Amino acid sequence: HHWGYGKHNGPEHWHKDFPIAKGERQSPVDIDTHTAKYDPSLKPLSVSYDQATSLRILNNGHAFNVEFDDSQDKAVLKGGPLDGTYRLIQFHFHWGSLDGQGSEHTVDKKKYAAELHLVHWNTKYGDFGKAVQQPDGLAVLGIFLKVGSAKPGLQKVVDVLDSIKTKGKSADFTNFDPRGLLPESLDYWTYPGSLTTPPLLECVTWIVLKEPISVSSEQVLKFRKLNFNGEGEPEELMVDNWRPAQPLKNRQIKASFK
Ligand SMILES: [Co+2]
């Protein structure tokens, strides 16, 4: 049926409509820190978000997306394992019903409360729709969230969520600075993988930061008040919208640090 994260249409069902779900480079994965190889040939990441133009926030029935103007090189990711320039198109989170789960990637099987995905597309391909058809089409920056002190830069997001409680609702969301969601260190792990939602295309260079950000219990509880359903349908809280770890298969995770 229409895919989601429930008992009958969750991740274990996706392969029936999207056979690539059992592919050779699916995401997310467990990051075994002892096994990842330090790769001194790797460059530092270049995150250049100073001219980012946020536009809107949308509840799409799976998560909420903060969308950006990607019609110019305003907010880009370069360097690290990447060739060329990748433009920020949107960010979103995955989170749990409880603080013990919610992330998609895991680190030595540790699950974080949530995971932020900053999604960027390779410019060489002109638009997002074309980029997802290419093995180097997307670069997604993954950042773990743990529960502890509040993240000041996240509060503007948390506060608009009650205006987009249900599927299909959107709201204006301008002048948001995504630099306020980054941890101090840009040390990372990287590997080739996929989108973690249908259509699960194998088009992503994943860059997962080692350092988590902290958010407060109150901030994540507001995430969990969102809904998967549309307005005036039975309430299904938007929680546990994460895909579990997939087989690593023939892939190597590289580390940018020692
Ligand atoms: Co995601």
| Resolution limit, Å | 1.5
C-alpha angle with apex 110: 14 to 7, nearest 5 degrees?
30
What residues form DSSP beta bridges with 86?
77, 122
Residue 250: give its domain's CATH number: 3.10.200.10
State how far the Cα of 63 lies from the Cα of 84, in Å rounded to an integer: 29
Number of domains in the chain: 1
Q: Which of 97, 123, 115 is nearest to 236 (CA)?
A: 97
Residue 199's domain comprises 1-258
Task: State the first-to-last Cα distance of the chain, in angstroms, to the nearest integer.
Answer: 45
Separation CA 76–CA 120 (nearest Å): 7
The CA distance from 15 to 3, in Å, is 10
Taking the centre of ligand 1 as the mean of its atom positions, its distance from the CA of residue 117, in whole angstroms, is: 5
Q: Are 225 and 217 in contact (CB under 8 A)?
A: no
Closest-CA residue to 208 (of 140, 121, 114): 140
Distance between CA atoms of 154 and 83, rounded to whole angstroms?
Answer: 30
Distance 119 CA to ligand 1 centre (A): 8
- The answer to whether the annotation marks 120 as part of a ligand binding site is no
Distance (Å, whole) CA 211 – CA 209: 6
Q: Are 23 and 200 in contact (CB under 8 A)?
A: yes
Asked how this structure was determined, the answer is X-ray
Residue 2 annotated in ligand binding: no
Inter-residue contact 94 to 18 (CB < 8 Å): no
State the burial class of residue 235 (Cβ atoms within 10 Å of its Cβ: 0-12, 13-18, 19+).
exposed
Helices (runs of H) and strands (runs of E) counted in the chain:
4, 15
Residues belonging to the chain:
258
Query: What is the DSSP secondary-structure string of 95-128?
Result: E-SSTT---SSEETTBPPSEEEEEEEEE---SSH
Q: Confirm whether 62 is a catalytic residue.
A: yes
- CA pair distance 220, 94, nearest whole angstrom: 11
